[PDB]
Amino acid sequence: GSSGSSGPGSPPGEGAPLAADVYVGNLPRDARVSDLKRALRELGSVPLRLTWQGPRRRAFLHYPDSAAAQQAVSCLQGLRLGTDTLRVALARQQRDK
């Protein structure tokens, strides 16, 4: 074997909006909320609320607090349904009225 190095450094979580909403796009043609839910369940990534859209092919996971979200995301990452690789990433947008 061979090892002996660290790799610290993670997107801080203080001061910025407590937006604990994860964005999910690039869903199959006729994807089913279940398909996604299941994976989330087994992955212990079950949020309080989940907004799934059909014709729009989008999904929004609402976690209790940022922490909960972050942890989940890292896990969700990579996960894909079929051939297409779902586009999962913390929902962030600068929309100021």
* 2 belongs to a structural domain: no
Long-range contact list for 88-97, CB < 8 A, 24+ apart?
88/22, 88/23, 88/24, 89/22, 89/23, 90/19, 90/21, 90/22, 90/23, 91/19, 91/21, 91/22, 91/23, 91/60, 92/19, 92/23
Query: CATH number of the domain that 22 lies in?
Result: 3.30.70.330
12: phi > 0 → left, psi -120 to 50 → alpha, else beta; which? beta
* 23 belongs to a structural domain: yes
* 1 belongs to a structural domain: no
* 3 belongs to a structural domain: no
- On whether the CB atoms of residues 44 and 91 are closer than 8 A, the answer is no
* 4 belongs to a structural domain: no
Q: How many domains does the chain have?
A: 1
Which of 2, 55, 8, 4 shows the shortest CA–CA distance to 29?
A: 55
Listed in sequence order, the DSSP H helices in 1-97 are 33-42, 66-76
How was this model experimentally determined?
NMR
- CA separation for the pair 97, 27 (Å, rounded): 30
- Reading the block at residue 7, the tokens are 């790799």
Would strands 49-53 and 87-90 be described as parallel, antiparallel, or unpaired?
Answer: unpaired
